[PDB]
Design a protein around this ligand. Sequence first.
Ligand code: CL
Ligand code: CL
Ligand code: CL
Ligand code: CL
Lengths: 68, 68
Amino acid sequence: SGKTIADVQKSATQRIRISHRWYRGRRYVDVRLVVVDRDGDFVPTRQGISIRPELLAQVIQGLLLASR
Amino acid sequence: SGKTIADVQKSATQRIRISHRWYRGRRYVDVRLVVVDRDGDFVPTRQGISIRPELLAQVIQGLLLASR
Ligand SMILES: [Cl-]
Ligand SMILES: [Cl-]
Ligand SMILES: [Cl-]
Ligand SMILES: [Cl-]
C-alpha cells in the first residue's frame, strides 16, 4: 500500500502511522491510526486522513499553533 | 465541545480541522476531516486522529519528513 515515513507509538497496541500513499498519480500523506489485531499484527484502521502535498504546510502550522 | 485551533480548506465541502479536545481532565490534539451535512454546517467524520500532547512533536516531525 504506502511507504512508512514515521510510526508514532501511542501505546503497546496502537500507533499513528504517517506514510506516503500514491493514488491515481498523486502522492498523498496518509496519517492513520494502526492497531494490533487478534493475530498480533498492526493493521490500519479507518481512523485516518489523506493530506495532499499542497495542504501539508498549513496542517503543520496548525499543529504548531496547537502546541503548548 | 473542543476548541478549534485552525481550519485548512481542502474543498468547497471540506476542511481539515485541528482542535483541542478533552476527555475529562485530559487534553488531546485532534486532526480530523470535517464535511458538510446541512448547508455550510461542518460535521466531523471518523476520518481523523487524536494525539496526546507528548506525541505532537513526533507527528510534526513525521509530517515534515513527509514533505520530502
Ligand atoms: Cl485531496
Ligand atoms: Cl497537491
Ligand atoms: Cl494518545
Ligand atoms: Cl501527554
